[PDB]
Scaffold this active site. Structure first.
Site, PDB file in Angstrom:
ATOM      1  CE1 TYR A   1       9.704  -9.306  27.888  1.00 30.79           C
ATOM      2  CE2 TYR A   1      11.769 -10.315  27.123  1.00 30.79           C
ATOM      3  CZ  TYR A   1      10.547  -9.692  26.857  1.00 30.79           C
ATOM      4  OH  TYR A   1      10.190  -9.468  25.539  1.00 30.79           O
TER       5      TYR A   1
ATOM      6  N   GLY B   1       2.162 -11.619  16.147  1.00 28.88           N
ATOM      7  CA  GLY B   1       1.570 -10.675  15.225  1.00 28.88           C
ATOM      8  C   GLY B   1       0.807  -9.630  16.023  1.00 28.88           C
ATOM      9  CB  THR B   2       1.821  -6.953  17.679  1.00 36.63           C
ATOM     10  OG1 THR B   2       2.082  -8.079  18.528  1.00 36.63           O
ATOM     11  CG2 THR B   2       1.427  -5.782  18.543  1.00 36.63           C
TER      12      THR B   2
ATOM     13  NE  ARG C   1       3.247  -7.566  25.817  1.00 37.55           N
ATOM     14  CZ  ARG C   1       2.402  -8.082  24.918  1.00 37.55           C
ATOM     15  NH1 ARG C   1       1.094  -7.922  25.042  1.00 37.55           N
ATOM     16  NH2 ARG C   1       2.864  -8.816  23.912  1.00 37.55           N
TER      17      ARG C   1
ATOM     18  CD  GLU D   1       1.875 -15.750  24.172  1.00 36.57           C
ATOM     19  OE1 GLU D   1       2.032 -14.560  23.790  1.00 36.57           O
ATOM     20  OE2 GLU D   1       2.278 -16.718  23.490  1.00 36.57           O
TER      21      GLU D   1
HETATM   22 FE   FE2 Z   1       5.815  -8.929  15.513  1.00 32.46          FE
END
Ligand code: FE2
Length: 401
Positions: free
Chosen positions: A339, A224-225, A358, A207
């Protein structure tokens, strides 16, 4: 100088031997920068700003990192050139007047490279085997860190925090091979690889922290994953599951509403709108709820003001942001370094800032990958551990030696 795909880019980067270089993917282009014609370097605790060009080295006043960054962009060796940048996690603490334990990587570098290769397929203009990783190790300690965050949240200290874990890697990593193999397995919004002063990082950013074009500012919170690590039936089952899981939706909307507030701090009143509301975004090993928020910068605000407000992504730090940053420094026991930071590309049309997730990092003392989970009051430690392993599977399977 002109000429008539990803393998080629990867091989080019191997010929760049030990030299400093910067790779940035922004479709339709791959940008390659090599060397250093001018650079602003902010050290790890934000006590020194060093500027270097061919004429010499300078120390610049560092009362305001944003002001050093502005100074650099208006410098005569810099104006009109493409700039490649990195912003460490701790830039936020420094900008916000929050004590922090300094890591080892710089808070901010901006570089004008000496030579550039722009791939706009299948052309290019010129200007001038895998490491097995056990992502489960030390999970019990991590679930403890999450349990601590959940307890702090339910006591009312803050609403959301990203608790992350570093996985140390056994051997050093071949950057161009990892780039090649890692990219074919991901669909990021940006890709990057940078080498500089003995430090390397590569990754597939899911993102944007921020994009500014003229007066319009955009941010793209993802929160949200679920995995997309099965057959297509399992994946679209996970997609539906994600769109209807009240914990993930709640986590998502809390982040989007904080992104809105942040932008309203720097934008004309009434200009901040959600252009895309909580759609699913596919990101290699995982898929995410994502929104796009945009606004018009007020007259007395520039892109650095917007970046200072937007950095770090809510979805990498927490809510409210300052309390979350404090919690992160109390809870995590290794420095994040780059990070959850940002990679920057700045040019004529645009200020572009990709979130560093990532991703893999190595320097003279450490070699590691890193992932986190957004902890809210409803969170479960086991689930958040699993979620970090789902995110790590975006990069770990493709670390080439
Ligand atoms: Fe989460």
């Amino acid at each position: 100088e002109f000429l008539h795909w990803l393998p080629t880019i990867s091989g080019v980067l191997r010929q760049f031997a030990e030299e400093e270089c910067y790779v940035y993917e922004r479709q339709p282009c791959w940008y390659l920068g090599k060397g250093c014609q001018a650079r602003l370097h902010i050290n790890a605790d934000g006590t020194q700003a060093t500027f270097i060009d061919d004429a010499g080295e300078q120390k610049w006043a560092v009362d305001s990192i944003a002001d050093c960054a502005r100074r650099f962009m208006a410098h005569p060796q810099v104006k009109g050139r493409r700039v490649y940048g990195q912003v460490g996690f701790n830039f936020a603490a420094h900008a916000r007047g929050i004590a922090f334990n300094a890591g080892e990587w710089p808070l901010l570098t901006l570089t004008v490279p000496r030579e550039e290769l722009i791939f706009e397929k299948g052309n290019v203009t010129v200007y001038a085997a895998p490491l097995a990783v056990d992502t489960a190790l030390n999970g019990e300690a991590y679930k403890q860190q999450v349990a601590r965050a959940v307890a702090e949240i339910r006591r009312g200290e803050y609403v959301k925090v990203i608790v992350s874990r570093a996985i140390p890697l056994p051997s050093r990593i071949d950057m161009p091979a990892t780039l090649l193999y890692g990219r074919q397995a991901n669909t990021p919004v940006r890709s990057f690889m940078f080498r500089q002063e003995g430090r390397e990082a590569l990754g597939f950013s899911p993102e944007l922290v921020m994009s500014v074009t003229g007066n319009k500012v955009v941010t793209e919170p993802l929160a949200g994953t679920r995995d997309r690590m099965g057959n297509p039936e399992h994946n679209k089952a996970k997609e539906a599951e994600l769109l209807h899981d009240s914990k993930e939706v709640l986590e998502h909307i809390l982040s989007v509403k904080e992104a809105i507030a942040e932008l309203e701090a720097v934008c004309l009143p009434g200009s901040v709108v959600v252009e895309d509301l909580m759609s699913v975004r596919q990101r290699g090993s995982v898929q995410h709820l994502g929104s796009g928020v945009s606004g018009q910068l007020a007259e007395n605000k520039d892109a650095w003001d917007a970046f200072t407000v937007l950095f770090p992504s809510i979805t990498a730090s927490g809510i409210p942001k300052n309390a979350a940053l404090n919690a992160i420094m109390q809870i995590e026991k290794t420095p994040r370094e780059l990070y959850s930071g940002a990679i920057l590309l700045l040019d004529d049309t645009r200020f572009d800032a990709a979130l560093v997730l990532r991703s893999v990092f190595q320097d003279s003392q450490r070699c590691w990958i890193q992932a986190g989970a957004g902890i809210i009051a409803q969170s479960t430690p086991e689930r958040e551990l699993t979620e970090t392993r789902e995110k790590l599977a975006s990069i770990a399977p493709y670390l080439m030696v």
